[PDB]
């Protein structure tokens, strides 16, 4: 971890806190593999997600994390869902100099696959045989363990 100090500017590389010793599943190529966490994390698991996210909510590079691509896509989607749900109050976007947010009521949302900004309203709902389906959840998380009798209803 390199930090720049400030004309003459000097940067110091500082030691980083280490992962807890004795991973549950050694020999794992990726940290998720090492910890047997492949199919047991969700967007609600902010504690795990926060480790791979920048202080202002930015995604950290995959190479630094070292996890495999499959988890990278899953983690990125989980983090995005948490941000859209306002579950990361300390990782909100940075105000450049003095800008302030919309300062308007914010609607509580969760399990949002895509940004509310870019989703248009569905004016025509459709009939019984023409009913339109609304996607809920993420396809990337299909492999996650399900404790229900039947697979969850992704499309509402």
């Amino acid at each position: 971890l390199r930090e720049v100090v400030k004309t003459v500017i000097e940067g110091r590389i500082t030691e980083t806190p280490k992962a807890t010793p004795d991973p549950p599943n050694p020999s794992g190529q990726c940290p998720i593999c090492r910890w047997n966490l492949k199919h047991k994390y969700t967007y609600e698991d902010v504690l795990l997600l926060s480790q791979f996210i920048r202080p202002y909510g930015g995604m950290l590079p995959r190479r630094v994390t070292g996890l495999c691509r499959e988890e990278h896509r899953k983690i990125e989607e989980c983090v995005k869902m948490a941000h859209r749900a306002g579950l990361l109050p300390n990782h909100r976007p940075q105000l450049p100099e003095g800008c302030l947010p919309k300062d308007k009521p914010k609607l509580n949302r969760y399990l949002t696959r895509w940004a509310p900004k870019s989703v248009k309203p569905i004016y025509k709902k459709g009939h019984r045989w023409n009913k339109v389906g609304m996607a809920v959840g993420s396809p990337l998380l299909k492999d996650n363990v399900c404790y229900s009798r039947r697979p969850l209803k992704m499309m509402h």
């Binding site: 020999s27 794992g28 190529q29 990726c30 998720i32 593999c33 492949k38 495999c68 691509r69 499959e70």
Partner: peptide
């Protein structure tokens, strides 16, 4: 017919699940 559509789904092959994915392999 509804019954005929059932047969098509049955023909779908059932694949076993590998223990560990290639990326997460030891």
């Amino acid at each position: 017919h509804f019954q005929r559509q059932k047969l098509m789904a049955i023909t779908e092959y059932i694949p076993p699940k590998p223990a560990i994915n290639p990326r997460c392999l030891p």
